[PDB]
Amino acid sequence: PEAYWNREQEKLNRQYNPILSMNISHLNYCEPDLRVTSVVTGFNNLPDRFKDFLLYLRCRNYSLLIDQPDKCAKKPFLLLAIKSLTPHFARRQAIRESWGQESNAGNQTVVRVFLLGQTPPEDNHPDLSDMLKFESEKHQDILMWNYRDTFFNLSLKEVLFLRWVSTSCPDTEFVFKGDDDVFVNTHHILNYLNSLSKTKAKDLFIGDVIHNAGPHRDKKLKYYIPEVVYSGLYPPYAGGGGFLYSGHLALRLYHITDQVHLYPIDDVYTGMCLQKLGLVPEKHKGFRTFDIEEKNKNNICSYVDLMLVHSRKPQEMIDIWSQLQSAHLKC
Ligand SMILES: *[C@@H]1O[C@H](CO)[C@@H](O[C@@H]2O[C@H](CO)[C@@H](O[C@@H]3O[C@H](CO[C@H]4O[C@H](CO)[C@@H](O)[C@H](O)[C@@H]4O)[C@@H](O)[C@H](O[C@H]4O[C@H](CO)[C@@H](O)[C@H](O)[C@@H]4O)[C@@H]3O)[C@H](O)[C@H]2NC(C)=O)[C@H](O)[C@H]1NC(C)=O
Ligand SMILES: CC(=O)N[C@H]1[C@@H](OP(=O)(O)OP(=O)(O)OC[C@H]2O[C@@H](n3ccc(=O)[nH]c3=O)[C@H](O)[C@@H]2O)O[C@H](CO)[C@@H](O)[C@@H]1O
Ligand SMILES: *[C@@H]1O[C@H](CO)[C@@H](O)[C@H](O)[C@H]1NC(C)=O
Ligand SMILES: [Cl-]
Ligand SMILES: [Mg+2]
Ligand SMILES: [Mg+2]
């Protein structure tokens, strides 16, 4: 293949599969990979996010600057992992007070971590480090790694989080991973998990699954991908707004990430890893990555049988959660 990602991924396959038989690491090489500037046609005219992505593609051994090593001291039933950016204090606090509160009903432990990278001064971010330290010491739910938190590094956020699950939470029965702008019906998720056989729970992966998609080639769009970078269709994948999977599958996914090069779209990368495990993510009608109908937004009963809705402001999560607590008396 002439697209760079497909070509490098093909070399990874030959390295991990002897059946294809007939030098720098791809995991901890953290100097700029200068070979790309001549191998990728038109490299110097690509947007800077693609330049950074290609140059540092082969580095993924980043360290935890803020950890919660005992977050899973009690074996969790459901681990909530929410991707967030440093300045999103209102979003995280609204999630703590509403659908992301830690609980222990029925001795089914629900624990919560927020997943952050760094917002460094070199990239003109305001210094909010003291506020973040304050928030971490009070709420103890912040995991932070030492890489530039950007959209094109979100698949790195996924791999580093899966590494944390494998080292610090390998016994969690289920994992929900989602965004910090979605409302999640945590009560409905728990009822769904308790209705699953152990056979079905073992390789659980459900979400708003997209089939037969491909890279957008419109340079003006958010998910634009040049043809010199990737070619062909995307594997099936759940919309990143939120998906639900078992801890057992989380450990298998982490192991397989070594065999898949990082990709600028994080939920596509998780689909590539599922495909390499021989699994297909399962569409579930309760995942509304594109919101619900206008008139239904006002009726709390529209939320009783949903898993999540995208998107919702901090104030809206709290209002929906509060009304939802008495929805069994009204719907
Ligand atoms: C995902 O997250 C990772 C981890 O944070 C990011 O990786 C970092 O990327 C930055 C670039 O954004 C890297 O910083 C750059 O390093 C270049 C190479 O530095 C080496 O080589 C020079 C020259 O030999 C040495 O001087 C240097 O000490 C290193 O040995 C620098 O050349 C860059 O300089 C830039 O900034 C200066 C101003 O400070 C300008 O004047 C320059 O012209 C130039 O623009 C820059 O410092 C950094 O090394 C990466 N870190 C790691 C750990 O890999 C990814 O970028 C990020 N990916 C995405 C897509 O966001
Ligand atoms: C509903 C839905 O399908 N959302 C997906 C969409 O994001 P979307 O288009 O919804 O854009 P958002 O601003 O909501 O960001 C998505 C999520 O990633 C977090 N975030 C964003 C930027 C960043 O640098 N670091 C960070 O952690 C946000 O806090 C947020 O939780 O495309 C992203 C990939 O590009 C996916 O990861 C998102 O799951
Ligand atoms: C990753 O490991 C390599 C090899 O030991 C090392 O040179 C590099 O500095 C590491 N990267 C980070 C971000 O620690
Ligand atoms: Cl916010
Ligand atoms: Mg650059
Ligand atoms: Mg969003």
Residue numbers in the entry: 55 to 76, 89 to 397
Can you quote the paper on this entry?
β1,3-N-acetylglucosaminyltransferases (B3GNTs) are Golgi-resident glycosyltransferases involved in the biosynthesis of poly-N-acetyl-lactosamine chains. They catalyze the addition of the N-acetylglucosamine to the N-acetyl-lactosamine repeat as a key step of the chain elongation process. Among the characterized B3GNTs, B3GNT2 is the major poly-N-acetyl-lactosamine synthase, and deletion of its coding gene dramatically reduced the cell surface poly-N-acetyl-lactosamine and led to hypersensitive and hyperresponsive immunocytes. The luminal domain of B3GNT2 comprises an N-terminal helical domain (Pro55–Cys125) and a C-terminal catalytic domain (Cys138–Cys397) as well as an extended linker (Arg126–Lys137) that connects the helical domain to the catalytic domain.
By soaking B3GNT2 crystals with either the donor substrate UDP-GlcNAc or the acceptor substrate LacNAc, we were able to obtain B3GNT2 structures (B3GNT2_UDPGlcNAc and B3GNT2_LacNAc) in the substrate-bound states. In the B3GNT2_UDPGlcNAc structure, the donor substrate UDP-GlcNAc is positioned at the bottom of the cleft with the GlcNAc moiety close to the center of the cleft. The side chains of Asp215 and Lys223 are hydrogen bonded to the uracil ring of the UDP moiety, whereas the side chain of Asp246 is hydrogen bonded to the ribose hydroxyls. The pyrophosphate group of UDP clamps the divalent Mg ion in a bidentate manner. Two pyrophosphate oxygen atoms, Asp247 from the signature DXD motif (Asp245-Asp246-Asp247 in B3GNT2), a conserved His376, and two water molecules, coordinate the Mg ion with the tetragonal bipyramidal geometry. The side chains of Lys149, Asp245 (the other Asp from the signature DXD motif), Tyr289, and Asp332 are involved in hydrogen bond interactions with the GlcNAc moiety with Asp245 engaged in additional interaction with the nitrogen of the N-acetyl group. These interactions force the GlcNAc moiety to bend toward the cleft wall, almost perpendicular to the pyrophosphate and parallel to the uracil ring, and fully expose the C1 atom for the nucleophilic attack. And superposition of the B3GNT2_UDPGlcNAc and B3GNT2_LacNAc structures shows that the acceptor substrate LacNAc binds right above the donor substrate UDP-GlcNAc in the substrate-binding cleft. The hydroxyl group on C3 of the Gal in the acceptor substrate points to the C1 of the GlcNAc in the donor substrate at a distance of 3.7 Å. The Asp333, which is 2.7 Å from the hydroxyl group on C3 of Gal in the acceptor substrate LacNAc, serves as the active site base and abstracts the proton from this hydroxyl group. This facilitates the nucleophilic attack on the exposed C1 of the GlcNAc in the donor substrate UDP-GlcNAc, which undergoes an oxocarbenium ion–like transition state.
